[PDB]
Short mmCIF file of C-alpha atoms in Angstrom, two decimals:
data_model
loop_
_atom_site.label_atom_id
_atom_site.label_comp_id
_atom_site.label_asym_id
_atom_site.label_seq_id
_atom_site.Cartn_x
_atom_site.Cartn_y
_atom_site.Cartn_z
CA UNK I 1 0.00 0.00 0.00
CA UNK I 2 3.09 2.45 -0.14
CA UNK I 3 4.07 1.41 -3.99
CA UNK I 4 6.66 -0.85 -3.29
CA UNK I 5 8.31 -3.35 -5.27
CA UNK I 6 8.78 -6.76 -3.33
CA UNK I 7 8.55 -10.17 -4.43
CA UNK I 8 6.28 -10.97 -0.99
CA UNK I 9 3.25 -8.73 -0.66
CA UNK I 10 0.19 -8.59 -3.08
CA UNK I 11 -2.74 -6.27 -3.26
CA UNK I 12 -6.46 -6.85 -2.72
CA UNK I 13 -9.66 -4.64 -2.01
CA UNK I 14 -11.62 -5.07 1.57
CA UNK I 15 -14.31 -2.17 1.58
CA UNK I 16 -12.07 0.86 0.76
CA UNK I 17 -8.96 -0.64 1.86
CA UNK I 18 -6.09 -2.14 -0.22
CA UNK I 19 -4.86 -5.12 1.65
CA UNK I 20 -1.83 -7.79 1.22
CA UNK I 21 -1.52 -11.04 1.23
CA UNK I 22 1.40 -13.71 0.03
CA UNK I 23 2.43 -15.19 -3.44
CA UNK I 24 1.40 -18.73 -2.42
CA UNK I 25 -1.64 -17.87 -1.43
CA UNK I 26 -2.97 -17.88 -4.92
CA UNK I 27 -2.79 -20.89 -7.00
CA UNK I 28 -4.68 -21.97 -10.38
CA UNK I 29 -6.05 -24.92 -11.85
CA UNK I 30 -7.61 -26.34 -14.81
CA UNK I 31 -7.71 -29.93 -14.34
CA UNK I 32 -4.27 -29.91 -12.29
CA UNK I 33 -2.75 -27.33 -10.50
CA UNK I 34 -0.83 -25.14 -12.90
CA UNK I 35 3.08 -23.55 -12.43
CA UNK I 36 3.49 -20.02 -12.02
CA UNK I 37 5.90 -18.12 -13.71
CA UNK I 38 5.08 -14.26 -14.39
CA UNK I 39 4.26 -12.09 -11.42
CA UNK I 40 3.16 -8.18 -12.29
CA UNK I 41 0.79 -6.02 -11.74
CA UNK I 42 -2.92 -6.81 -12.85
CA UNK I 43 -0.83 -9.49 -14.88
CA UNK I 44 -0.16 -13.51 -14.10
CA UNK I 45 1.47 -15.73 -16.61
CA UNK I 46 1.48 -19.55 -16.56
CA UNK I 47 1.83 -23.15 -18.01
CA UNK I 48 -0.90 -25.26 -17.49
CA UNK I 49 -2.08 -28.85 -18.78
CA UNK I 50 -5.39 -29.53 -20.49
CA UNK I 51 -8.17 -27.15 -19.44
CA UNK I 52 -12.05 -27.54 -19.23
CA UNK I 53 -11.96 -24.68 -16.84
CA UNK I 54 -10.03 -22.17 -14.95
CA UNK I 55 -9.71 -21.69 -11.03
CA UNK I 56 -8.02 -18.95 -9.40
CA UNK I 57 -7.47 -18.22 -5.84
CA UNK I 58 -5.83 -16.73 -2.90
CA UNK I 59 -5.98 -16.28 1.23
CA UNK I 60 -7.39 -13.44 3.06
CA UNK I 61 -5.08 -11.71 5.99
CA UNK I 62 -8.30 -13.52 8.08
CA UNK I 63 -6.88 -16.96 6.20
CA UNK I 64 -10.27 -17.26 4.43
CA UNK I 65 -9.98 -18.25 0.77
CA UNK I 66 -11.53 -16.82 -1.91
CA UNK I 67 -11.23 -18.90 -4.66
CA UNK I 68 -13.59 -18.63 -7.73
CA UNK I 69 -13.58 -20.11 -11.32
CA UNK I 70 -14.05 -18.95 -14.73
CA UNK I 71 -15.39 -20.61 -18.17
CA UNK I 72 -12.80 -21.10 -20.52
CA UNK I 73 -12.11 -23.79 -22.70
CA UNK I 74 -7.96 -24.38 -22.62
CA UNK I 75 -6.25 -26.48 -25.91
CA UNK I 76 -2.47 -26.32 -26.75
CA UNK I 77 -2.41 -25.85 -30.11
CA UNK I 78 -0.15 -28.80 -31.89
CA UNK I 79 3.40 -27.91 -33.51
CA UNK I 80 4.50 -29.78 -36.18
CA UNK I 81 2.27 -33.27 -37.16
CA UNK I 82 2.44 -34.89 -33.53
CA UNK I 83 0.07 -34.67 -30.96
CA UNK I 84 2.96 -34.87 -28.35
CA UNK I 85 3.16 -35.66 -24.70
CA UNK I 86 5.84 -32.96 -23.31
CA UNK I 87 9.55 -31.65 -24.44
CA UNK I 88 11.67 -34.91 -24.97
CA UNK I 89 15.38 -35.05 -25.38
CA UNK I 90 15.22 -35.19 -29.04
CA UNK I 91 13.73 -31.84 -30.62
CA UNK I 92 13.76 -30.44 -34.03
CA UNK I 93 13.82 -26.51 -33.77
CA UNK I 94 10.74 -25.75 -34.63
CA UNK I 95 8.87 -21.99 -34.52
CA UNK I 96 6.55 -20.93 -32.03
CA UNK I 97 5.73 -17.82 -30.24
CA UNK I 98 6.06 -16.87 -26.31
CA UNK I 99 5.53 -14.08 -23.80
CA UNK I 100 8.70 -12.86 -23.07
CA UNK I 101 9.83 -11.69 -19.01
CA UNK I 102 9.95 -7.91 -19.69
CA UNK I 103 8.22 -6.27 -16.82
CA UNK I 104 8.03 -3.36 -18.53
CA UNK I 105 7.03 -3.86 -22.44
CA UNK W 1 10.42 -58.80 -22.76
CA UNK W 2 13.70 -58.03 -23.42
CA UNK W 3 16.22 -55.06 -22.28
CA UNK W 4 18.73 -52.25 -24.01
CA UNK W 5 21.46 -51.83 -21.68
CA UNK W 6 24.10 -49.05 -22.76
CA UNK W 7 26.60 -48.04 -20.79
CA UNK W 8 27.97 -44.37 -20.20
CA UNK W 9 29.01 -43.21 -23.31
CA UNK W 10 33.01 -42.64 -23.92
CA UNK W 11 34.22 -39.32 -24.62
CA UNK W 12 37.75 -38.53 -27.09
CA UNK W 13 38.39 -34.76 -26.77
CA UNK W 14 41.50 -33.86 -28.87
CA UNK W 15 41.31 -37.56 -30.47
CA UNK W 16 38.78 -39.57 -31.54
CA UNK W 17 37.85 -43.01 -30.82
CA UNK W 18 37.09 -46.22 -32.27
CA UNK W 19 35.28 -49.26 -31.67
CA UNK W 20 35.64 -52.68 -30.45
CA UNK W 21 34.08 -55.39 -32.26
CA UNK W 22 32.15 -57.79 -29.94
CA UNK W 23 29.66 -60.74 -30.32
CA UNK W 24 27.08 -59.09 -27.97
CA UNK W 25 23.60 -59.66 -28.62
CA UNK W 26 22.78 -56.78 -30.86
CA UNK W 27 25.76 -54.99 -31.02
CA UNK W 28 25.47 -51.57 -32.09
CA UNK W 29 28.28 -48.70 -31.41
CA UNK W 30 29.19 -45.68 -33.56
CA UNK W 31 31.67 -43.12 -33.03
CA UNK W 32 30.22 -39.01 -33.83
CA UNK W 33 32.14 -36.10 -34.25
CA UNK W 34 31.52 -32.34 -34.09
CA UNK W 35 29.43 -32.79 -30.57
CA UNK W 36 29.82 -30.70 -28.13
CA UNK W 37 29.01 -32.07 -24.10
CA UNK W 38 27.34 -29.97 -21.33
CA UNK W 39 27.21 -30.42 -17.55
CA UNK W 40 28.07 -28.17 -14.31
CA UNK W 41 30.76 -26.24 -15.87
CA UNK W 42 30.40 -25.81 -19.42
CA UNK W 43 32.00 -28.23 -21.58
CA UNK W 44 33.21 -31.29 -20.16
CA UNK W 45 36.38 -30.97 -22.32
CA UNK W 46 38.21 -28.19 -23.55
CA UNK W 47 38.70 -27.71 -27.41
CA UNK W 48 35.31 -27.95 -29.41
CA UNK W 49 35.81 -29.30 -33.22
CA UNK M 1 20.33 -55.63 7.69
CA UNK M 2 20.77 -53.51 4.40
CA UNK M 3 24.45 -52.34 4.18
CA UNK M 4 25.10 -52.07 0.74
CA UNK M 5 25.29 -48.66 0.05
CA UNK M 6 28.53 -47.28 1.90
CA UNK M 7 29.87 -46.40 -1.68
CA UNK M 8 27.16 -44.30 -3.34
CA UNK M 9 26.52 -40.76 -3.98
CA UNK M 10 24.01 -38.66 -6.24
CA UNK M 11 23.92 -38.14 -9.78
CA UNK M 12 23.64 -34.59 -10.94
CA UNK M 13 22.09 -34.97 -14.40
CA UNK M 14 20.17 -33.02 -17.40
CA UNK M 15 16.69 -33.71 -16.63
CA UNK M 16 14.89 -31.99 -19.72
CA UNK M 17 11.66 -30.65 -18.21
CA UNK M 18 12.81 -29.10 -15.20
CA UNK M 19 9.32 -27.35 -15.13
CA UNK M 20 10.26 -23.68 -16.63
CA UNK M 21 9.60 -25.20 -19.94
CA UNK M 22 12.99 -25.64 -20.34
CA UNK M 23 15.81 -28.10 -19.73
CA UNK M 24 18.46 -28.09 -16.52
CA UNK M 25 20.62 -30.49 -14.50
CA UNK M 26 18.55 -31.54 -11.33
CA UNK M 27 19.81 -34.27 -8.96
CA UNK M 28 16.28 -35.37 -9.54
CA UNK M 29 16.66 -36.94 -13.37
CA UNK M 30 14.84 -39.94 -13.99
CA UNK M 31 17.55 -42.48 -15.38
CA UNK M 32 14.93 -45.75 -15.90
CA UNK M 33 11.63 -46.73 -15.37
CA UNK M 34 10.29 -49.96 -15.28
CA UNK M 35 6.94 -51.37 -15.04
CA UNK M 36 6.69 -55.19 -16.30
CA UNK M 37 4.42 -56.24 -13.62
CA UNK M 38 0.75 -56.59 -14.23
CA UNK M 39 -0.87 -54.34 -11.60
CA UNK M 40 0.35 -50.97 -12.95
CA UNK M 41 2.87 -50.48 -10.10
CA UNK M 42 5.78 -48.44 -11.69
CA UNK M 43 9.45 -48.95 -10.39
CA UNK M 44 11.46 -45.61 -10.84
CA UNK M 45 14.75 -45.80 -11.28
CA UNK M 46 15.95 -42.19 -10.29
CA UNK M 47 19.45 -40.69 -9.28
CA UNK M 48 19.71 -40.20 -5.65
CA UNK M 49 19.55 -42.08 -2.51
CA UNK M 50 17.24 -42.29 0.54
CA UNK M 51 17.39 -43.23 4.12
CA UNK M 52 21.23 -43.68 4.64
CA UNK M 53 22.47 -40.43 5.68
CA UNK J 1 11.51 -57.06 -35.83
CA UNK J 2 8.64 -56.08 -33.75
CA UNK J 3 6.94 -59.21 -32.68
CA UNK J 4 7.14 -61.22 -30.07
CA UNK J 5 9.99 -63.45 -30.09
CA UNK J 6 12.00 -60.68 -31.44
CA UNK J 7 14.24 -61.93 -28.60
CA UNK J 8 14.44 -65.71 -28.26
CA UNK J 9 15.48 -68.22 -25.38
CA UNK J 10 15.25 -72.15 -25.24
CA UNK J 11 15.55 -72.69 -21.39
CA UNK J 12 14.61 -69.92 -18.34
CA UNK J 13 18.42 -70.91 -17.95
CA UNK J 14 19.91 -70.20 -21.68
CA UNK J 15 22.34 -67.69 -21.31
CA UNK J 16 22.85 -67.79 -25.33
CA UNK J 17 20.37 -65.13 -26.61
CA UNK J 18 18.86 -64.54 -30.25
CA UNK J 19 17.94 -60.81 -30.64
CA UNK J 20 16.43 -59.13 -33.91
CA UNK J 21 15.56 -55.68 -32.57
CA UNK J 22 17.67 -52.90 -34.45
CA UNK J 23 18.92 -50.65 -31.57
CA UNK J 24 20.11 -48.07 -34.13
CA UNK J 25 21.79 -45.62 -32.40
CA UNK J 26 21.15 -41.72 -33.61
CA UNK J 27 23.22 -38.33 -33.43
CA UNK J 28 23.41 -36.05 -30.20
CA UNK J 29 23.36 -32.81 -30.14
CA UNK J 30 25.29 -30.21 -28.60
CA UNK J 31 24.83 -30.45 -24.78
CA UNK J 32 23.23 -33.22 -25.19
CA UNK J 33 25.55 -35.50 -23.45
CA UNK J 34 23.22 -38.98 -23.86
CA UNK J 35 23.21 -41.83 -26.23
CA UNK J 36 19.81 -41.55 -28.77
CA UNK J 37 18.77 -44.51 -30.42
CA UNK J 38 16.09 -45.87 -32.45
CA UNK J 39 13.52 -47.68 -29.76
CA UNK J 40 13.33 -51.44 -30.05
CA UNK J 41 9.30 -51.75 -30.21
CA UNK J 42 8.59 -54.43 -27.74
CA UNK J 43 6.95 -58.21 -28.57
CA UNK J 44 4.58 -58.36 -25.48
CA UNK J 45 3.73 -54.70 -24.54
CA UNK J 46 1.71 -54.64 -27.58
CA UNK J 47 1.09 -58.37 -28.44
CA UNK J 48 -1.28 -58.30 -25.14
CA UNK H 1 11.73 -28.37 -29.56
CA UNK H 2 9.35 -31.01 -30.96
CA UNK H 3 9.99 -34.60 -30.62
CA UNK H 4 10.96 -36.61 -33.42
CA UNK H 5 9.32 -40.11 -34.11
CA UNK H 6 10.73 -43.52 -33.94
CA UNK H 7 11.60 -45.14 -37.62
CA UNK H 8 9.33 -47.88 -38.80
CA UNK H 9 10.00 -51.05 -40.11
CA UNK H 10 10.25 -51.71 -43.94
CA UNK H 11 10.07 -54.34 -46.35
CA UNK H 12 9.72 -54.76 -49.93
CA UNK H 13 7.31 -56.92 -52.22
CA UNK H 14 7.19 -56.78 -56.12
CA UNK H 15 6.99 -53.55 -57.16
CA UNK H 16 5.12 -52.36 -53.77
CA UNK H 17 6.38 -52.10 -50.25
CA UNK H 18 4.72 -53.19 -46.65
CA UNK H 19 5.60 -50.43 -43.49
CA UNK H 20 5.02 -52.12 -39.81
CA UNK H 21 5.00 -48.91 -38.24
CA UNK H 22 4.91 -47.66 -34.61
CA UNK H 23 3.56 -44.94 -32.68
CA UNK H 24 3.04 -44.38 -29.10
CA UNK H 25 1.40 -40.63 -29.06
CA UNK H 26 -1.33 -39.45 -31.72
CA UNK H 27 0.83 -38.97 -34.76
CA UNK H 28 0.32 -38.44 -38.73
CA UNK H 29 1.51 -40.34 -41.82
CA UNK H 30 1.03 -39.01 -45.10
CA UNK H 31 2.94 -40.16 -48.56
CA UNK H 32 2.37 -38.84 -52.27
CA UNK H 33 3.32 -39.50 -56.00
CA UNK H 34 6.05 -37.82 -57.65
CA UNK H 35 4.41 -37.54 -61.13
CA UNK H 36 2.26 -35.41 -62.96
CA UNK H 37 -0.42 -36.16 -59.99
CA UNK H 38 0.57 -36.18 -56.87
CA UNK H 39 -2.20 -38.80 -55.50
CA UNK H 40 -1.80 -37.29 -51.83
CA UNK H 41 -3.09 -39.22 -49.35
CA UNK H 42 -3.00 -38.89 -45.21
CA UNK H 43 -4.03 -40.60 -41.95
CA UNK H 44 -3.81 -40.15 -38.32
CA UNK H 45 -2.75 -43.30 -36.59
CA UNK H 46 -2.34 -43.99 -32.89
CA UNK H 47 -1.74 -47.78 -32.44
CA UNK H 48 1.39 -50.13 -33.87
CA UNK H 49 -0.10 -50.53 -37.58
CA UNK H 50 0.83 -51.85 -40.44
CA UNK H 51 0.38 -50.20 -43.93
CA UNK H 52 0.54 -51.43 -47.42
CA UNK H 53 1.45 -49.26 -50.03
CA UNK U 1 3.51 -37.51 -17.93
CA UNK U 2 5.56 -38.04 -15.14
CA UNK U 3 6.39 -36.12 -12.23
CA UNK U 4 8.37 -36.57 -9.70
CA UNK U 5 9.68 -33.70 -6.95
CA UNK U 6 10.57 -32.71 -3.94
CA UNK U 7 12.39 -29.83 -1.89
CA UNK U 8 15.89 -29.26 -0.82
CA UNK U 9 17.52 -27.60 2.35
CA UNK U 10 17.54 -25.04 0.03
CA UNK U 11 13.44 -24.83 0.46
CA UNK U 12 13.70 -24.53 -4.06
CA UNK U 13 11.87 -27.42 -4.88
CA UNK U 14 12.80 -29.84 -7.93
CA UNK U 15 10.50 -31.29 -10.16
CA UNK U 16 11.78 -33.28 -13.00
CA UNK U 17 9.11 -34.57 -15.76
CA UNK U 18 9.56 -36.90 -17.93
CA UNK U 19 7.35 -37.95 -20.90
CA UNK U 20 6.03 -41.45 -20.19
CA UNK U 21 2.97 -42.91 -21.81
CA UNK U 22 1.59 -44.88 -18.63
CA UNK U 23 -1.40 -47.06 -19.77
CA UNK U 24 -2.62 -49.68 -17.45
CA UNK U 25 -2.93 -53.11 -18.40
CA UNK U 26 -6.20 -54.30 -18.48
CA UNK U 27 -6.85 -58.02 -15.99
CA UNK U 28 -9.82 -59.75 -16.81
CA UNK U 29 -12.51 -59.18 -19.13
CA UNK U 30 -13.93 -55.75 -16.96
CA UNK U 31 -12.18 -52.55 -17.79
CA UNK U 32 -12.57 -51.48 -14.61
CA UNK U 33 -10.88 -48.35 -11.78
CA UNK U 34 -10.55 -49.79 -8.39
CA UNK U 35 -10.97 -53.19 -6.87
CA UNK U 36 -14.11 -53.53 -4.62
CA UNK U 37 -14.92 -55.61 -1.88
CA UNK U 38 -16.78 -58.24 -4.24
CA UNK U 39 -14.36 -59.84 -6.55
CA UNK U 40 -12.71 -63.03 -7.95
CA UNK U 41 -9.13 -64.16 -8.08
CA UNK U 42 -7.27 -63.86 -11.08
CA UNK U 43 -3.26 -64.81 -11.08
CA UNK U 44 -1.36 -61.56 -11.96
CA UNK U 45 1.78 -59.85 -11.15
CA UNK U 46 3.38 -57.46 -8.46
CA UNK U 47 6.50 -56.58 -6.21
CA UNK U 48 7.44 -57.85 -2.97
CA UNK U 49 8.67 -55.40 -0.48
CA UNK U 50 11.76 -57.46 0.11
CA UNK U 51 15.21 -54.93 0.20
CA UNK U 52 17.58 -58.46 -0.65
CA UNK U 53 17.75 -59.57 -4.29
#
């Protein structure tokens, strides 16, 4: 609440009062629990198997969680002609297109 | 059912190996050049072609 | 009772999905994996050791 | 090659092994530091 | 990095050729003519399959 | 897949992941999950817990 920059603390409205709370507090899911890799602002970037649905959720300071879901239909789009399982020691470089770690784009 | 044992794989930096022929079941060795091994710190060997 | 293992120690190797996508050394690399017997138990053969200090 | 009885025994005991299997063994890359091969398909994983 | 695929096995009959051919993740196959037509022709296959051609 | 993780003195947590297509083999003539409490006896195959071999 004093614009800081920390790796710990996270914002959250309570009736005209921003509040913090933790990094693991949140988690997502859309039939496993997903990895988290990209932490800023309004912003959250992950990795995340198959998806029906998405979850998202965190802990109050009063440790209660609010946790609430979203419809959104999650495929992987294929590259190349296999419908693959994950990265394997043998790749051919093939093209594809990520979000970058540039806090400020 | 059967199994593929291979052992660690032999590595000539500044030389290059050869074989061994062997009456193993299924005998299959190769030597490759041009590679170019990883691990904690760097290349395992020093030179690279 | 089970002293065997008085001449081991871990094997730091390239495990290729080290989550992050992409590819790092982790003590952690599965090496083999078996799993010949019927009832879909599966027998992981990974790099380091447990219980002996 | 891919059947069962790819690899052959005439006792539990025989030592002396025939194999037809083709472990072909492929290039590495750099870092890499592994031996790729072409994957013997199995006789029983698929035969049951 | 995509993953490659393991190579089939091949043999020969007169003037055509048999492919025993194995897959252990969804994958395609396709093959064509060289002529004036190329007669293109594709399938997906997910189970250890043999194909005449 | 397969996963398989844990966490150092570090507290940074490994997790290796290898691609493994697990598929179960099926005993019987029933595709079925779990074993209930009503069922016959089939001869199949497991591990012991044993640590000598």
């Amino acid at each position: 609440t004093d614009d800081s920059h920390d790796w710990t603390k996270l914002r959250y409205m309570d009736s005209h009062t921003p509040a913090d709370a933790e990094r693991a507090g949140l988690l997502v899911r859309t039939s496993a629990p997903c990895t988290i890799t990209g932490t800023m602002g309004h912003f959250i970037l992950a990795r995340c198997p198959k998806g029906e649905t998405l979850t998202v959720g965190f802990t109050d300071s009063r440790k209660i969680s609010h946790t609430c879901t979203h419809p959104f239909h999650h495929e992987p789009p294929v590259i190349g002609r296999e419908r693959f399982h994950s990265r394997p020691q043998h790749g051919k470089e093939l093209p594809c297109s990520t979000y970058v770690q540039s806090t400020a784009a | 059912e059967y199994k593929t044992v291979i052992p660690s794989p032999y590595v000539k930096c500044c030389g290059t190996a050869e074989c061994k022929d062997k009456s193993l079941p299924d005998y299959s060795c190769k030597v490759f050049t041009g590679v170019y091994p990883f691990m904690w710190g760097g290349a395992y060997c020093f030179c690279d072609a | 009772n089970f002293n065997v293992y008085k001449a081991t120690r871990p094997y730091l190797a390239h495990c290729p999905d080290c989550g992050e996508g992409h590819s790092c050394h982790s003590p952690i690399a599965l090496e083999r994996i078996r799993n010949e017997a019927t009832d879909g138990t599966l027998k992981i053969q990974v790099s380091l050791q447990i219980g002996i200090k | 090659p891919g059947q069962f009885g790819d690899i052959q025994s005439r006792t539990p005991e025989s030592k002396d092994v025939y194999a037809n299997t083709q472990l072909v063994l492929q290039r590495p890359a750099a870092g890499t530091v592994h031996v790729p091969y072409s994957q013997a398909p199995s006789g029983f994983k698929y035969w049951l | 990095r995509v993953p490659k695929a393991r190579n089939p096995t091949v043999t020969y009959g007169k003037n055509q050729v048999t492919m025993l051919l194995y897959p252990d993740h969804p994958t395609l196959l396709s093959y064509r003519n060289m002529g004036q037509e190329p007669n293109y022709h594709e399938e997906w296959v997910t189970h250890k399959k043999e194909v005449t051609l």
